[PDB]
Design a protein around this ligand. Structure first.
Ligand SMILES: CCCCCCCCCCCCCCCCCC(=O)OC[C@H](COP(=O)(O)OCCN)OC(=O)CCCCCCCCCCCCCCCCC
Ligand SMILES: CCCCCCCCCCCCCCCCCC(=O)OC[C@H](COP(=O)(O)OCCN)OC(=O)CCCCCCCCCCCCCCCCC
Ligand SMILES: CCCCCCCCCCCCCCCCCC(=O)OC[C@H](COP(=O)(O)OCCN)OC(=O)CCCCCCCCCCCCCCCCC
Ligand SMILES: CCCCCCCCCCCCCCCCCC(=O)OC[C@H](COP(=O)(O)OCCN)OC(=O)CCCCCCCCCCCCCCCCC
Ligand SMILES: CCCCCCCCCCCCCCCCCC(=O)OC[C@H](COP(=O)(O)OCCN)OC(=O)CCCCCCCCCCCCCCCCC
Ligand SMILES: CCCCCCCCCCCCCCCCCC(=O)OC[C@H](COP(=O)(O)OCCN)OC(=O)CCCCCCCCCCCCCCCCC
Ligand SMILES: CCCCCCCCCCCC(=O)OC[C@H](COP(=O)(O)OCC[N+](C)(C)C)OC(=O)CCCCCCCCCCC
Ligand SMILES: CCCCCCCCCCCC(=O)OC[C@H](COP(=O)(O)OCC[N+](C)(C)C)OC(=O)CCCCCCCCCCC
Ligand SMILES: CCCCCCCCCCCC(=O)OC[C@H](COP(=O)(O)OCC[N+](C)(C)C)OC(=O)CCCCCCCCCCC
Ligand SMILES: CCCCCCCCCCCC(=O)OC[C@H](COP(=O)(O)OCC[N+](C)(C)C)OC(=O)CCCCCCCCCCC
Ligand SMILES: CCCCCCCCCCCC(=O)OC[C@H](COP(=O)(O)OCC[N+](C)(C)C)OC(=O)CCCCCCCCCCC
Ligand SMILES: CCCCCCCCCCCC(=O)OC[C@H](COP(=O)(O)OCC[N+](C)(C)C)OC(=O)CCCCCCCCCCC
Lengths: 28, 10, 90, 491, 69, 642, 158
């Protein structure tokens, strides 16, 4: 079915910024 | 009909 | 009135004379703009010849077109710094 | 009859405002009448001062001869010689025009101290205008860096949340780099005993020394245009400085680097400018391409406008370093056109949206044409002007700069044509978002563009269209002055 | 029908089906002005237009080519 | 006469744009229609004076650019080529404007729509009437500007907003190459005037001409929606139907064809570009036809038909048949506009305003007048003999075989399949909308009625022009020896004889047999054996249907790969360069360096006799040491800072 | 007009209302900002804050300055670029080329006739244009003669 676009990182660590699963709002 | 009223005079 | 160019060459002046050097720079620039004016007049002949000739523009405007392409590489503003600072003879 | 009248009148103007506002400061606990209505009578006097400054250069413009080679209106003042030619005349007019526009932009959006702001703005306008009419390197550098002191305090006092960081960036980036330019100026005064424009243009230095002098001067210039990779200060300064500071910085200061190339590099270091031209093109092309792509990822409204100025001035640097009249004229035309469109984009972003919602994040704005139609009309029109659409002065400047670049270097100069696509990519993506879709759910309906903001946008749009449709108003003045900067020996 | 907030939203192009009460009076004022511009354009066009294929005789072109040689 | 023809449409745009509030919706629409009609009549007068009397009109407003040898003026010329382009432009624009009066009657923003619609007409007039390439570029850019404002007219709709941006940015890609081509033109010839550049075509280097016209070719593909720059064409369907009718008939979509025909004197001396144009047009004709046979939106099918027909003009250009391309361009502007108008009439007739043909069916009896306009336009599109399309399209397909080269033979098959598909999707579109069993609810059919006379009137005028127009104008453009010096054909490239005589008699009727005969086979299968087309059963058919229904997956490839990577490059530049290394070599890195160095120096300042005494005694070693050791001391000092 | 008694009447009405946030014929002369004493000045300011509190985007104090000083100034700039006797270097070079045409071919009767009837405003319009004028011989002589003296200034060659 749906899949994320390219160049979307699996992980990130920007200090204390919340870490949430990348979601494409177009597919909502 | 739609009978759209005319607006204020310009 | 129409002021004319004070014809002065870099080869017949002393650069220590600031007035003579100023005239040589101006004289070279004014001669280069005359070439551009001549190029535009020659191009006007090519434009007029092309329209009236129609399918005969290759033959009727052959010499005019050849003249335009030869003058184009050098009928442009070149400045004075190049010739002022360089001696072709050396 | 120019510099003497301009300095004396403005100094008297500065004294007049100081005497009136600071007379009752002696712990009087007073109310006074000059301070009524946010010091209206003190803002009005400063606005009148800016208008009179324009009339001063117009009187000298009437006597300007476009068929005369060399500097005109030569004048001795403060042991300094001052003169005007075709290139200097137009840049002075642009600087003085933005005077009243910058003051009118912050008419009633400052928290206080309007008199200090008005004096600082007028001081900056005159100092930058004087920098176009000085006739030696030392006088050029004095006015080049004198503007830092009023600008550093102006940003640090009237700035946004990060004004402290922005004040450090502008002060240190523009001084540490200009000091390298001072070294080249000092070298000129050591080996030639003079820094006069005419005197140093006739002297040919060794090819190694010209390389050293060019690098020292270009560091100060490249930081000020700005060029990559010394450009990071500019987005920070624009995003935090007041609107009037942004107008002067985007409209005048960034044009001093292009004028600096005209005075300090082309006529005195002509041989080394030809050698450095491929390097300058590579830096400017990458500056143009990278800045456009970086702009696509920005979220701050005013930062997007700041990066757009970097890409346009890269074209100006490319055009001005072309060794033909087409590229040189186009670079000068684009500088004048950018001097009007760029402040307008800051006015639309940092003066209209910010003065109502006070947030510069892009996520809060969409569908603004529903309740702000007048704003959207100017936003769309100025967006097309910024992208080089014809009938605007930017197109005339960009096309001639690109054409001159191709004439100078057909292979790599062709890459300058990417500005036509890249500029439309980031500018329209911003404009398409601000006008498309439904009105933002995070915004409350409020007033549209007021009469004061209409005046600012209209009188910045008018010069752009006039130059775009009939640029011969500008070309006729520039043709004789610009033809002197070309270095070529055709045999 | 709906609510368009026309009290303050007054774009140059109308704002959601706008027609002033005095639309007939302004329409005549526009038609006369529009007609006064087409005639002015016609007079300017006729007096300024020319035929680029007739401004020079072919004999004149022959002399231009021979001199350009 | 020339000034009235050109700038009158601009007056209508200004009147509705700024005075539309003060005159109302109805008067704004008709005044704009009046302004276009004045240009229509003035164009027809000039067409007789220019084409038949061999007269030219030139108006020079003022000088634009006067930079040394580069002189550009605000001049407009009306020659045979310009007035030939004006007839499709102004006439269809007026009929679309007349069509737009009743089609947009329920829109709250009609004044702005007509302001944008008339502005587009003025921009296109400037494009074809300028006497130099820069004046052409002015119309070239404002064509994209007006189209951007028209596709995204309903700016409250997300899809329309993003579709308008897609059309603008892709067209700006061509504009970037167009600027580069003009710059090279100034580099080589020092001018952009038609009278100057076209007089030097035979004397210029072939490599120089190729570079200029390669830039022209790239710009043409964006406007004409050829292969590689065609995704925006289907996204243009987000705008109102009058926009699509005007856009895809005698407007921006045809701008790319005009640019190559204008540059014919230069284009004849670079045969390699002609080879590229021939293949690019041939590939686009084959691809467009295949996609249109598995498409469901009624406007998408017609839009794909426009792309297929424009490619037919390109292959005519590729074989140096500029007269063939121009004549098919004029004829196509008439019956293709009729298809869009009648398609929009079907959408308005149905109460639900559905646009999918799968929800249509049995409309033939309920709306016969719209069906006849579609039926006549379809036959004209299918090059049925006797109609306008037959005299304009059938000759181009013949010219491919008549070229008698390897490329021409291959393109002939691509054009032949394109012609076969042209009849196939026309029958398929008609059957689903008018002849299929009803799919929409019964409540739709009891309220299904034809539209008003105002909508009908332009369609009838176009319908008659779609029957007799091509026959009357064939000799002007396709006649042998007809003087059209504006379009230059080299003597070595005249193949109108080998195309007309040497062709086998079978090839003269082969497109007709595959069209009508192939269409009958498709019609019989649909009516009686529809179980064949239940393609969801077969796996290969499902993939094949999906591949062409998704338009050769080009939209997915363009977005998921090209656009995403271009945005990620900016992200990489922003993260690793702008916010990265330039901050390490900047304020952030220098702050950490300053903090480390200043912390060490803060511990060196304290009141202690022993500390200062040792430093003073240590400095005595500088006197003792030979000076050549100073740099070693300098390295030692830095080591202690660590 | 300061009208000190007007502030006394105004202040009393404000003082009559102990509550706040719950006249048109008033102005100030230029001498009011400098010659008024402390007692009179303080009364105006206290009223102004309270009167403003009792409350679009008009009468901000810039309209008269910009429309009398700035807008006419821009008109003057527009007039200068339009109606100033400025001879650009390219315009000068065109006249010089025709002047050198006369000074080199003074024996050509046909050339002098066209030049005399070629008006100054039409000097720079040589070529095909809307103006009915005779300049074919003028163009022909230029096509045959190089009237520039650039080689004369370059007296040194390779
Ligand atoms: C009335 C008496 C006033 C003083 C008269 C005088 O002799 O002072 C000299 C000068 C007048 O000019 P003059 O003597 O003709 O010679 C040119 C030198 N400026 O008058 C002056 O030089 C006074 C100049 C005062 C303003 C100078 C302040 C400098 C502004 C900052 C520098 C910005 C530019 C760098
Ligand atoms: C949005 C679009 C923006 C623009 C996108 C990029 C396009 C602009 C840059 C591409 C180049 C534009 C055209 C430049 C080539 C034109 C010159 C030419 O005609 O090519 C052939 C020419 C050699 O001529 P020749 O006579 O054979 O030399 C004999 C020497 N004894 O000269 C040559 O040898 C050709 C030179 C090598 C080819 C260079 C092209 C590659 C450029 C890559 C740029 C980075 C990507
Ligand atoms: C929204 C903000 C407001 C901006 C909107 C309005 C912008 C208007 C822009 C106008 C710019 C000024 C151009 C006109 C200035 C006059 C030009 C001129 O100096 O005259 C040149 C020409 C002949 O030159 P010459 O023989 O030297 O005469 C000089 C006598 N002193 O003499 C002439 O022939 C005069 C011709 C006058 C033409 C009137 C203007 C017509 C409209 C512009 C035409 C441009 C071409 C069409 C562009 C549309 C797109 C195709
Ligand atoms: C906002 C408005 C701001 C206006 C400021 C700009 C004003 C422009 C200055 C006007 C100067 C007067 C003028 O137009 O020049 C006279 C000229 C006729 O004289 P001539 O020199 O012989 O021209 C022949 C050219 N071959 O006349 C002309 O040549 C003008 C020719 C113009 C070409 C056709 C018009 C193009 C624009 C169409 C819309 C304008 C017409 C409608 C006017 C009302 C709407 C603006
Ligand atoms: C868009 C990108 C910007 C513009 C880039 C322009 C690139 C086109 C350059 C075409 C050219 O250089 O012409 C020569 C070309 C290849 O050169 P070559 O065949 O080796 O030598 C021919 C000498 N007469 O010879 C040819 O014409 C054949 C190959 C053309 C390739 C077209 C694809
Ligand atoms: C001229 C400016 C263009 C310079 C081209 C630079 C191409 C490039 O560096 O692309 C790098 C990028 C791969 O990098 P990345 O995706 O971050 O790899 C780790 C993933 N976890 O790859 C990409 O982002 C795709 C770039 C393809 C277009 C080039
Ligand atoms: C062209 C040559 C000009 C040089 C002289 C300029 C004037 C100097 C200041 C003296 C008067 C003064 O300090 O007065 C202060 C004035 C008036 O501000 P205010 O809001 O009324 O003051 C506040 C009092 N309130 C709150 C009661 C109203 O503000 C200024 O400081 C403006 C001028 C200085 C701007 C730049 C400062 C840094 C200069 C660095 C130089 C390299
Ligand atoms: C040749 C072209 C030269 C161009 C300019 C050179 C770089 C200028 C950097 C701006 C610094 C600034 O603005 O100083 C202010 C910054 C503040 O840092 P901040 O932004 O608040 O973040 C950092 C703070 N934190 C981490 C708390 C958020 O303090 C510094 O960094 C102090 C050191 C600056 C020394 C600069 C000397 C440059 C020497 C000459 C070049 C070799
Ligand atoms: C050669 C160039 C000539 C250009 C002159 C053409 C006439 C100008 C008409 C302006 C009025 C108008 O249409 O803009 C304003 C109209 C008003 O909306 P409305 O339809 O009245 O409904 C009102 C309903 N709202 C409020 C929901 C919209 O739309 C807009 O806010 C659209 C925003 C972008 C406007 C783009 C203007 C055109 C840009 C041109 C770039 C060169
Ligand atoms: C028969 C004659 C045919 C020709 C007709 C000519 C009509 C001229 C226009 C008159 C109306 C007018 O100037 O409108 C001005 C308009 C209308 O808004 P406003 O006036 O500010 O009111 C709103 C403010 N309020 C609420 C305070 C009252 O302002 C604008 O936003 C105009 C922005 C410019 C749009 C066009 C830019 C074009 C750029 C490129 C140019 C080639
Ligand atoms: C993707 C695949 C597209 C189609 C591949 C064509 C293969 C082929 O064979 O095409 C060969 C063709 C034809 O020219 P030729 O046969 O090389 O020479 C013969 C030269 N005439 C024809 C003048 C006699 O040229 C091309 O390639 C066309 C350019 C590429 C278009 C894309
Ligand atoms: C010219 C050569 C013949 C091509 C036309 C055949 C008829 C046709 O394509 O139709 C046959 C079928 C289905 O019927 P449909 O037309 O999609 O309509 C019915 C719509 N369903 C399917 C939703 C009910 O399509 C195909 O999946 C054929 C392959 C798709 C690409 C077309 C050919 C590619 C090779």
């Amino acid at each position: 079915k749906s899949f994320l676009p390219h160049f979307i990182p699996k992980n990130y660590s920007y200090g204390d910024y919340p870490r949430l699963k990348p979601e494409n709002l177009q597919k909502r | 009909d739609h009978h759209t009223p005319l607006g204020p005079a310009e | 009135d129409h002021v004319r160019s004070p014809n002065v060459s870099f080869d017949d002046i002393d650069y220590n004379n600031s007035q003579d050097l100023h005239n040589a720079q101006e004289s070279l620039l004014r001669e280069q703009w005359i070439r551009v004016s001549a190029l535009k007049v020659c191009r006007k002949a090519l434009e007029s010849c092309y329209k009236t000739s129609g399918p005969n523009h290759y033959e009727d405007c052959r010499e005019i077109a050849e003249k335009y392409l030869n003058m184009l590489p050098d009928h442009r503003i070149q400045g004075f710094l190049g010739y002022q600072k360089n001696d072709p003879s050396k | 009859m120019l510099v003497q009248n301009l300095i004396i009148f403005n100094i008297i103007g500065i004294v007049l405002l100081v005497l009136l506002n600071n007379n009752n400061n002696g712990i009087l606990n007073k109310k006074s009448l000059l301070t009524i209505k946010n010091e209206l009578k003190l803002k009005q006097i400063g606005l009148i001062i800016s208008i009179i400054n324009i009339l001063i250069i117009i009187e000298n413009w009437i006597g300007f001869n476009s068929n005369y080679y060399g500097f005109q209106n030569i004048e001795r003042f403060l042991n300094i010689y001052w003169g005007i030619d075709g290139i200097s005349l137009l840049l002075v007019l642009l600087t003085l025009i933005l005077g009243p526009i910058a003051i009118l932009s912050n008419w009633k959006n400052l928290k206080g101290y309007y008199t200090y702001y008005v004096i600082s703005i007028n001081m900056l306008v005159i100092l930058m205008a004087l920098n176009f009419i000085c006739l030696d390197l030392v006088s050029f550098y004095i006015l080049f860096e004198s503007t830092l002191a009023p600008l550093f305090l102006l940003i640090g006092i009237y700035g946004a949340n990060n004004k402290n960081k922005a004040a450090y960036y502008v002060l240190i980036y523009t001084l540490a780099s200009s000091l390298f330019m001072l070294l080249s100026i000092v070298i000129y005064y050591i080996i030639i005993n003079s820094t006069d424009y005419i005197y140093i243009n006739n002297i040919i230095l060794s090819i190694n020394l010209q390389s050293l002098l060019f690098i020292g001067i270009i560091i100060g210039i490249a930081v000020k245009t700005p060029l990559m990779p010394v450009h990071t200060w500019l987005p920070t300064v624009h995003s935090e400085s007041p609107l009037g500071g942004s107008i002067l910085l985007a409209g005048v200061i960034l044009k001093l680097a292009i004028y600096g190339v005209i005075r300090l590099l082309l006529p005195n270091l002509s041989e080394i400018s030809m050698m450095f031209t491929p390097i300058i093109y590579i830096i400017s092309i990458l500056t143009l391409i990278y800045s456009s792509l970086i702009t696509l990822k920005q979220t701050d409204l005013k930062v997007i406008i700041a990066y757009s100025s970097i890409s346009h001035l890269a074209v100006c640097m490319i055009g001005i370093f072309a060794n033909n009249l087409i590229g040189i004229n186009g670079s000068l035309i684009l500088c004048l056109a950018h001097g009007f469109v760029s402040p307008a984009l800051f006015i639309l972003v940092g003066g209209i949206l910010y003065d109502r919602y006070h947030n510069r994040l892009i996520n809060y704005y969409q569908g603004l044409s529903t309740f702000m139609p007048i704003f959207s009309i100017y936003l769309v029109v100025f967006s097309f002007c910024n992208t080089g659409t014809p009938l605007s002065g930017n197109f005339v400047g960009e096309f001639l700069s690109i054409t001159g670049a191709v004439i100078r270097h057909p292979i790599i100069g062709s890459l300058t044509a990417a500005s036509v696509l890249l500029s439309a990519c980031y500018q329209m993506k911003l404009t398409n978002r601000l006008t498309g879709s439904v009105f933002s759910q995070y915004l409350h309906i409020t007033n549209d563009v007021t009469n004061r903001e209409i005046f600012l946008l209209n009188w910045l749009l008018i010069p752009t269209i006039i130059i775009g449709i009939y640029p011969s108003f500008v070309t006729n003045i520039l043709n004789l002055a610009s033809s002197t900067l070309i270095y070529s020996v055709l045999i | 029908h709906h609510i368009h907030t026309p009290s303050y939203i007054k774009p140059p192009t109308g704002g959601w089906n706008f027609t002033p009460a005095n639309w007939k009076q302004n329409t005549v004022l526009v038609l006369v002005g529009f007609t006064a511009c087409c005639v002015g354009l016609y007079k300017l066009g006729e007096a300024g237009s020319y035929n680029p294929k007739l401004k020079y005789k072919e004999e004149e072109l022959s002399r231009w080519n021979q001199s350009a040689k | 006469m020339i000034l009235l023809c050109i700038f009158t449409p601009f007056l209508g745009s200004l009147i509705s744009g700024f005075f539309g509030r003060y005159i109302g919706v109805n008067s704004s629409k008709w005044i704009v229609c009046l302004s276009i009609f004045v240009s229509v009549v003035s164009t027809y007068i000039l067409f007789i004076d220019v084409i038949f009397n061999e007269i030219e009109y030139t108006y020079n407003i003022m000088n634009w650019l006067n930079v040394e040898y580069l002189v550009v003026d605000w001049s407009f010329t009306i020659d045979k080529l310009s007035v030939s382009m004006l007839v499709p432009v102004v006439t269809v624009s007026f009929l679309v404007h007349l069509y737009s009066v009743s089609y947009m009657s329920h829109d709250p923003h009609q004044q702005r729509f007509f302001s944008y619609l008339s502005m587009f007409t003025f921009a296109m007039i400037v494009l074809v009437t300028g006497d130099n390439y820069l004046i052409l570029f002015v119309g070239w850019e404002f064509i994209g500007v007006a189209s951007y404002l028209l596709i995204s007219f309903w700016f409250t709709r997300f899809n329309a907003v993003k579709s308008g941006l897609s059309a603008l940015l892709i067209n700006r890609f061509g504009d970037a190459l167009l600027v580069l081509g003009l710059s090279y033109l100034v580099l080589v010839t020092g001018s952009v005037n038609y009278n100057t550049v076209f007089a030097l075509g035979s004397y210029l280097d072939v490599n120089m001409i190729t570079v200029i016209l390669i830039c022209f070719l790239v710009a043409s593909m964006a406007k004409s929606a050829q292969l590689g720059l065609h995704s925006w064409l289907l996204l243009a369907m987000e705008g109102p139907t009058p926009v699509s009718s005007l856009l895809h008939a005698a407007c921006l979509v045809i701008a790319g064809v005009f640019l190559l025909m204008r540059s014919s004197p230069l284009l004849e001396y670079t045969p390699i570009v002609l080879l590229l144009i021939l293949w690019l047009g041939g590939l686009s004709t084959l691809i467009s036809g295949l996609i249109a046979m598995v498409s469901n939106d009624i406007k998408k099918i017609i839009a794909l038909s426009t792309m297929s027909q424009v490619g037919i003009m390109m292959i005519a250009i590729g074989v140096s048949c500029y007269n063939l391309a121009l004549f098919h361009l004029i004829c196509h502007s008439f019956f293709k506009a009729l298809l869009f108008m009648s398609a929009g009439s079907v959408i308005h007739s149905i109460i639900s305003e559905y646009q999918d043909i799968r929800m249509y069916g049995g409309f033939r009896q309920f709306i016969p007048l719209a069906y006849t306009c579609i039926f006549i336009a379809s036959l004209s599109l299918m090059a049925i003999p006797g109609l306008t399309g037959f005299y304009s399209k059938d000759i181009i397909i013949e010219s491919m075989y008549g070229e008698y080269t390897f490329s021409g033979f291959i393109i002939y098959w691509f054009a032949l399949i394109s012609a076969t598909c042209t009849s196939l999707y026309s029958i398929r579109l008609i059957y689903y909308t008018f002849l299929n069993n009803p799919n929409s609810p019964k409540y739709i059919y009891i309220n299904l009625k034809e539209n008003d006379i105002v909508l009908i009137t332009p369609m009838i005028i176009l319908t008659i022009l779609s029957i007799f127009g091509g026959y009357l104008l064939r000799d002007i453009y396709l006649g042998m020896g007809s003087p059209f010096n504006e379009l230059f054909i080299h003597p070595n490239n005249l193949s109108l004889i080998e195309t007309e005589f040497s062709l086998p008699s079978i090839l003269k009727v082969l497109p007709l047999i595959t069209g009508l005969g192939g269409g009958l086979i498709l019609l019989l299968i649909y009516e009686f054996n529809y179980s064949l087309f239940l393609v969801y059963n077969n796996k290969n058919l499902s993939k094949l249907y999906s591949f062409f229904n998704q338009k050769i997956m080009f939209d997915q490839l363009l977005n998921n790969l090209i656009l995403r990577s271009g945005l990620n490059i900016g992200w990489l530049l922003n993260v690793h360069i702008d916010r990265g290394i330039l901050q390490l070599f900047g304020p952030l890195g220098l702050w950490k360096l300053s903090t480390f160095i200043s912390s060490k120096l803060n511990k060196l300042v304290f009141l202690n006799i022993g500390f200062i005494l040792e430093i003073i005694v240590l400095s005595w070693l500088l006197i003792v040491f030979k000076v050549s050791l100073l740099k070693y001391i300098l390295l030692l000092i830095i080591f202690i800072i660590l | 007009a300061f009208n000190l008694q007007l502030e006394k009447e105004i202040r009393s009405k404000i003082d009559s209302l102990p509550k706040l946030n719950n006249v048109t014929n008033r102005k100030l002369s230029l001498t009011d900002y400098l010659f008024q004493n402390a007692a009179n000045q303080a009364l105006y300011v206290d009223n102004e804050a309270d009167l403003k509190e009792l409350d679009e985007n008009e009468n901000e104090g810039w309209e008269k300055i910009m429309y009398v000083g700035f807008v006419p100034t821009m008109i003057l700039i527009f007039a200068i670029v339009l109606f100033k006797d400025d001879k650009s270097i390219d315009e000068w070079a065109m006249d010089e080329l025709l002047l050198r045409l006369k000074e080199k071919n003074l024996s050509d009767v046909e050339l002098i006739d066209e030049l005399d009837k070629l008006s100054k405003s039409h000097v720079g319009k040589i070529g095909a244009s809307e103006i009915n004028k005779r300049d074919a011989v003028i163009i022909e002589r230029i096509l045959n003669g190089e009237y520039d003296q650039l080689s004369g200034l370059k007296k040194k060659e390779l």
